[PDB]
């Protein structure tokens, strides 16, 4: 541990193009493992990791029926929120939810998540006490009052402390081996000439998993160059990730700069420099 189980929900109205797009995506430890999409040829919860293929038909039928119920509920709620905000009909709007649990290595709940957004802005969330709500505005206050009157927090807390934690335990047991996998980055430095006898040194990390990584450039043991260019970590398309970091240095000084690559897969951080052919 720690481990987490979270569902990311998206409902997008599209007047004139039929009923709203509706999707639910589940993650175990930030790895997608199940997905439902109303725009699939056959909308149904489907496994998104091979280890989920060990769940029998009852599981998929049950989860699919919940998704279909949630879909109908969010269809209503899109209309409701239009009313709360006195918005005109005919536009496309979005409700999103992040729902789930994080548990410690000892199996105890560390935190619960129930966060809503409307049109990409926070709307309502369950507080850390698992008992009260934070509403973002006067519209969300209406939902908050409905939920207080219905005892929704108590129902949700039962899910977060019970079902969510227990199913996470189940998923981890099936997916343990696969979830633990790491791929170490492979690194190299490239050299590019710039005007005024300057040089771009670019330190690449490729083929790594999971995405968390740190690249740094050092002159003389510092671990310290403030002004690098970095790109955001990006998916290679094969389940691994890429990143690079560059610095501009004077021609004739390239050999004094060192790139370090830090990743959980590595026995020790990588250290490399520009290797003149």
């Amino acid at each position: 541990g720690p481990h987490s189980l979270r569902y990311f929900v998206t409902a997008v109205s599209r007047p004139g193009l039929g009923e709203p797009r509706y999707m639910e995506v589940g993650y175990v430890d930030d790895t997608e493992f199940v997905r439902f999409d109303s725009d699939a040829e056959n909308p149904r919860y489907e496994p998104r990791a091979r280890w989920m293929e060990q769940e029998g038909p009852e599981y998929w039928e049950r989860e699919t029926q919940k998704a279909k119920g949630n879909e109908q509920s969010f269809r209503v709620d899109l209309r409701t929120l239009l009313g709360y905000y006195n918005q005109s009909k005919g536009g496309s709007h979005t409700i999103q939810v992040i729902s789930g649990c994080e548990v410690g290595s000892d199996g105890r709940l560390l935190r619960g998540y129930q966060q809503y957004a409307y049109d990409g802005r926070d709307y309502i969330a369950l507080n850390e006490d698992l008992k009260t709500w934070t509403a973002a505005d006067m519209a969300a206050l209406i939902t908050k009052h409905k939920w207080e009157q219905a005892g929704e927090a108590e129902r949700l807390r039962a899910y977060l402390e019970g079902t969510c934690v227990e199913w996470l335990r189940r998923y981890l047991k099936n997916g343990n081996a696969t979830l633990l996998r790491t791929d170490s980055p492979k690194a190299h430095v490239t050299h590019h000439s710039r005007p005024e006898d300057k040089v771009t040194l670019r330190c690449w990390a490729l083929g790594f998993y999971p995405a968390d990584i740190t690249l740094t450039w050092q002159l003389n043991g510092e671990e310290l160059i403030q002004d690098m260019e970095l790109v955001e970590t990006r998916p290679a398309g094969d389940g691994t990730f890429q990143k690079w970091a560059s610095v501009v240095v004077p021609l004739g000084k390239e050999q004094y700069y060192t790139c370090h690559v830090y990743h959980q897969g590595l026995p020790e951080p990588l250290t490399l420099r520009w290797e003149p052919c």
Partner: peptide, 8 residues
């Protein structure tokens, strides 16, 4: 297992 979400 997903939650059954509440009416807003």
């Amino acid at each position: 297992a997903v939650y059954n979400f509440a009416t807003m």
